[PDB]
């Protein structure tokens, strides 16, 4: 995934549970009929059949909308008899991009219905598009067939055709197809966790029943062949392939998954984060317009840290060039970039600094080593490991009397008046 990228588009309906308030034949078996019209608007002979939820070959559950839209016999969900207020809802186990919807009614399309989304797993909902035979009379909204931008539409509400009639909504409206698809403005429109259809009123086939040997009956019910929800895994443009989301058990389908295989040194379920060691500059979504990747930059830690965090104060201090700060410096290092050895250690020039043994422990003798005020312990020079010795004490470790001194002790070494080479133990010449 070199440049800005995106996973494959697909029907989010597949593999997931579509829910509906009701379905025909909930209790016992039920006779049901369908009525459509021909060119002369005369009612056709109604195909009738039995419905029963307990049996697969008679049931019409909501899941019949999420199945393949091209199988041997067409399948459809069918609500209980005599119901107007109905709701179809699709809950997603993660955040996905929703681009455009296609419903396909077997019965006549509803005289009124609305579509909306939840961006926060069902806590809140916000409209997408209203549908009615008259937007002004039903919802007090303008019709987009005239207003060219309205939120309501009668384009998909005509009783004819009484069967196979489709309802459609496209999130990628003229304003949203241009510009960067990952911008804040577009995410507001595309990103969703749920998708809900609320049917408000049924619609009877207004065809002429002249050729009918019997009056219409057992038809007051909703019916939908397919609930095609085109969309894709959301990854902020830092991925082109997704795996299953943790804890998700799907139900002959081509399922769309949500867990992003993140690229561009990003991380998180949707690449919203930077990789743990790549917080040197602020995260940013890939630019679909520009095609720019906007990939996370690594922190400099000299190989003494595997994690780091951004810092706006350090960021501005560098001149907006770098702001990473290494977390939990390993190998006895200390710096912001783990670039120095801690006190009580020093640079081992024999080794490279990136090496684990870059810093070597100090061997300052506790008694022979002098201590500075406002400190209770001696630490060696980090550059060469030389400890500051008390008077008369010598060496890099201050662990023995200087030449010409004796009586190693907590106050250094006494000068031997030989003078003359000393025996450091007794002071004899
Ligand atoms: C939608 O609005 C109404 C309801 O169907 C209808 O418009 C009526 O008739 C004329 C046509 O423009 C309007 O001036 C009246 O105010 C409406 N009367 C009522 C009682 O609503 C028409 O069916 C539709 N078309 C529109 C409004 O253009
Ligand atoms: C990089 O941009 C500027 C420095 O050139 C940083 O300061 C920002 O300045 C802009 C105006 O140019 C303001 O709108 C921002 O509010 C400033 N940021 C802050 C944190 O005060 C800016 O911070 C840097 N980039 C980022 C992402 O912080
Ligand atoms: C067999 C059956 O479905 N019985 C239901 C019952 O479970 C429910 O509590 C009641 C509420 O109206 O309606 C009836
Ligand atoms: C099934 O019967 C019960 C009454 O005991 C009640 O739920 C209703 O009449 C039937 N169910 C539906 C969904 O209509
Ligand atoms: Ca179907």
Numbering used by the authors: 30 to 280, 285 to 462
Question: What sentences appear in the manuscript?
Answer:
The netrin protein family is comprised of six members, the secreted netrins -1, -3, -4, -5 and the glycosylphosphatidylinositol (GPI)-anchored netrins-G1 and -G2 in mammals and exhibit homology to the N-terminal domains (LN-LEa1-3) of laminin short arms. Secreted netrins-1,-3 and -5 are homologous to the laminin γ1 chain, whereas netrin-4 (Net4) shares a higher identity to the β1 chain (50%). Our data demonstrate that Net4 not only strongly binds to laminin γ1 -thereby blocks efficiently laminin polymerization- but also actively disrupts pre-existing laminin networks in a non-enzymatic manner. Thus, our hypothesis is that Net4 is not a classic ligand activating a membrane receptor with a downstream signalling but rather a regulator of basal membrane maintenance, which indirectly impacts key functions such as axonal growth and angiogenesis.
In order to establish the structure-function relationship of Net4, we solved the crystal structure of Net4 lacking the C-terminal domain (Net4-ΔC) at 3.1 Å, revealing a head to stalk arrangement of 175 Å in length. The globular shaped N-terminal domain (LN) forms the head and the three and a half rod-like consecutive LE domains make up the stalk. The LN domain forms a β-sandwich jelly-roll motif with a front face composed of sheet S5-S2-S7 and a dorsal face composed of sheet S4-S3-S6-S1. The topology of this domain is similar to the N-terminal domain of Net1; however, the closest structural homologue is the short arm of laminin β1. The LN domain is stabilized by a complex pattern of disulfide bridges composed of 12 cysteine residues. Two disulfide bridges between cysteine residues 72–236 and 191–234, absent in any current netrin or laminin structure, hold the S6-S7 loop in place. Furthermore, there is clear electron density for glycan additions at three asparagine-linked glycosylation sites, Asn56, Asn163, and Asn353. Remarkably, Net4 is the first member of the netrin family with no N-linked glycan attachment at the dorsal face of the N-terminal domain. Net4-ΔC has a total accessible surface area of ∼28,000 Å2 and reveals extensive inter-domain contacts between the LN domain and subdomain LE1. Structural analysis of Net4 and previously published Net1 complex structures reveals incompatibility between the binding residues of Net1 and equivalently positioned residues of Net4.
